[PDB]
Amino acid sequence: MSEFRIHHDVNELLSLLRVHGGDGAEVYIDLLQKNRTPYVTTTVSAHSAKVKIAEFSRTPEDFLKKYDELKSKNTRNLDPLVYLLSKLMEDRETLQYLQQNAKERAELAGPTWQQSLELTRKMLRDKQSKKNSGQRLPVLPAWVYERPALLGDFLPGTGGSADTAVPIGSLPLASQEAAVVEDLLYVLVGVDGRYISAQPLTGRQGRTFLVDPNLDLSIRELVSRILPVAASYSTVTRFIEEKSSFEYGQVNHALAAAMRTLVKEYLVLVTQLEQLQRQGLLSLQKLWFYIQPAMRSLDILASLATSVDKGECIGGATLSLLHDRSFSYTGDSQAQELCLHLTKAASTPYFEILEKWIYRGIIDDPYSEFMVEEHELRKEKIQEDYNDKYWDQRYTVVQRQIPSFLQKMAGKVLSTGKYLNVVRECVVYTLKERAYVEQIEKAFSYASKVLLDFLMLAHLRSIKRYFLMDQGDFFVHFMDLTEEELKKPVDDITPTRLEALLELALRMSTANTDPFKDDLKIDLMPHDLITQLLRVLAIETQQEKAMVHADPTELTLSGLEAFSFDYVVTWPLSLIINRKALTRYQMLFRHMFYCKHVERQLCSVWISNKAAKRFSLHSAKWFAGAFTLRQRMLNFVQNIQSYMMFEVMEPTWHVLEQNLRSASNIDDVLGHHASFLDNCLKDCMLTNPELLRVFSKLMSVCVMFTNCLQRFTQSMKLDSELGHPQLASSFEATITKFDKNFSAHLLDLLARLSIYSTSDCEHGMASVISRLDFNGFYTERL
């Protein structure tokens, strides 16, 4: 459900139970995620579990009935659910705490089986109509429902025969036998008898058949013995003529076809037996004996049909019902051949759909019977949404549109199908999954490989050039354009003229051989770099309350720190880049761009102080101190930049490239990209709010110092270049405050880096500690 659904479940349970201590949600989540069965398919000591539930039951019968109903609805995790409930109610303390939590959360805040099936048909047609988003449904005019009881089936309202009714007792034994055989065979064809009467049924169940009490005790005994066959055939023909029409799923119609085939063979046999009894060459014992495997199959298929009808299974739900029907017994056969053939024919449309989906990628919903429930989603919007819609909502995962055998490898099947569908847009049933599991395995491996070859380095090259500021001469040129906008955030102005300035700067630099910069666009964030970073490093923490009043006016003013790069790419490349990664990209790019702007401003100040050489040494002592302070600022900025580029970004880019060049799976590529982004953000000290705040304060004070410098720097430069106590008054008292603040922020950064290296043991803080203390004057000040 959730990407961190173990954590979310732990948190919700702890909130409901009013528990936030003990071991902690961490231990429970970790033990849940680290101690797991592959999938919930193992059976338990199920009858011991049944006994335990019964002993904690007020009434075991209704609990067993609910279990049976859920099995008729092929529910998942039912025997394991009973086992877990038994283990829970074993302990009184856990039980009582759970009930106490539930009480706390509580206080703190007539249709017949034919009519039911017609209403179910209408609702299922409506459902497939919506689930298909408007795709066609199989609809035909049928008068079969207008008179089903008259077409050899059994419906509420059936009986015996009002036109064929004679006293069987008054009849001779042979005549009674003939009459009873005829009535039995009519019941076994679904129509009423003459002395065996199909009784009405409420709700779709096995059709019961009443035997006239006039029959002889042995005769009536054997009539009742057959009556199982009569009820089986009546229910079989009712299901046959109900699913015979195409309103339910493909599997339902295929099952009806196979069932009516077997019913027609059973009725051929029934007519042969009727004739043999007519000539007096049959006995009730021989009738019971002849079709013993046949009657076994009839009972098995009646149970399967009744489970289908009660749980209204269809699609993979019905497939799971059939698989469980043929899998509950398993091995050794007397009548399971019929059920296996029926299951294969029922899953033939579903198997063909799955083959098309996982061998070519073609998929569609005739009634949303399949694993896939169609939901059209935009591929491009994946790049604009934090959640990737293609995997989640484009094709969904359910527990009633998925066959029981296919659900085991549903993830691999779905991945291969999505790969093959991306490729194009650019199968038989077995008693065991393996037989087709290895199929969908190999089809997965090909689906990924071919998808990779259909999808391809150039995009990562453009990302490195723009976001990672490789060939940063364009960024040096853009520094001067961004410098004209320092009052209000850039988001106040449309990005069209910003992109026009960028493109007019482009053609003056060597950038012709990069056909990937057209995928870059300018986004106006509603927050500046410093503010957004602080809120990211303060969310889900007590810092959000404190810094909700924070503003960038007291700190460095943001007039160009909201500019960021985004990479919008078309499908299926729109699946690779998503808004969850785009937000990290934007934050990193804005931080890099503001750091580069600060460094270029510092270097420009230093180079413009070249006109100080036009003056003597002993008249710039205050200027000398200011220059030393700004040189320390620039050196710290340059060291930070060199570390965080040539010790972080190049190695992480190389690791990402190696992962892409080795792997082929797009999902694995996305995972590698996400891990790379996380590593980049952690090496940027974006996982420690204290360090991110210290970094922001340091670079803000550097920007403020350089902005205060530039005015009088330009003034004295103009004075010197036009002429060819004044210098002390030009040197303001704020320079000493700036120097002290820079020293304090540097010491705080070093201290926090060492503290985090000793406690958190992150790999990036020791490097910042080493770069901060590399002169023999701060390593004992660490």
């Binding site: 797991r36 069965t37 592959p38 999938y39 193992t42 059976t43 338990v44 000591s45 199920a46 009858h47 899998f327 509950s328 017994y329 398993t330 091995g331 393996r434």
Partner: protein, 372 residues
Amino acid sequence: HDWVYSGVFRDVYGEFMIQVNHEYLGCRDKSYWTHGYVLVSKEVEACVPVFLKHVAHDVYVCGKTINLLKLCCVQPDTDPLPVLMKHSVTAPLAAHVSLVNKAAVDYFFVELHLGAHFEALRHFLLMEDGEFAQSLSDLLFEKLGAGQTPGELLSPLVLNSVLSKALQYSLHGDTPHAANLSFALKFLPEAFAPNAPDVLSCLELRYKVDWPLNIVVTEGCLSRYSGIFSFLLQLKLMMWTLKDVCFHLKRTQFRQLQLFKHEMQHFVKVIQGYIANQILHVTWCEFRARLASVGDLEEIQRAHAEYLHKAVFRGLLTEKAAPAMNIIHSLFSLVLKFRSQLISQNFALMQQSYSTFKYYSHFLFKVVSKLV
């Protein structure tokens, strides 16, 4: 058949001893022998009716091995007509169970190189590579010496980086199974009374073994291999100090010290050749020429376990020989204390080292006679 040929046993309700309850294949921290076997009591106990127990355990183990390998792959009515049995059915089943087990263990032997891992752990974790060790330990002692380290080799970064420099030079190594060696400390090197005469060297060298072989080559054999690595390390320290003292004499009481050195070195050499016959030769021969080749999964584990037992037995780690081995440490220590002076290019210290060596060899002979 399902379990023998596919390594899983099916239960639908569960009321029997044999079952599969397999752990997932996503967790690769198992050894793959942890699959289900939860017992059930049968419904019979009168004479305790049973299936054929000859195969009843066999199927249980064979199916678990099949699951592990699939990751990579009588009559009393008067009528074998008389006589009820199950051997006409057991033989065709056992044939396939055995074939599956053989194939699994052969795959282990030929693909995961379990015997190569065993020889790697012998070479590295038991310090069997000479002229590698007789430069590695010497260069360690240059940064240490006289038994205990003098505040060095306290953390596994100096020793590991010396090992990294040493690793290009070896007489057994330069293999994928001789790479990824773990050199570590189980005790930081700080004595509560540092002494110049000492031979005590303990460090733990290990060799990586892949997951499917880490049921044969258990940690319990690697720990004994590292214990004998430490014993041979103390021996290499003693021969290092003897080389030092020979160099000290060479570059030049002296003759008497050399006489006592020769007598002690003779006796220590004969003791060391007894040790490096019984604990170093016969168990090494029966651990190199012990890997399974008929393809037994179990036999590799049993062979390693017996290799370890025999190495310890002839290593004198058994309580009967423990005093003898402890006296060997004191003889080494006395001969090192003697050799640390030698010719300088203390006579009293040399006489003390000679007396201690004679005491050590006397005590060794007394322990050996007492155990005899």
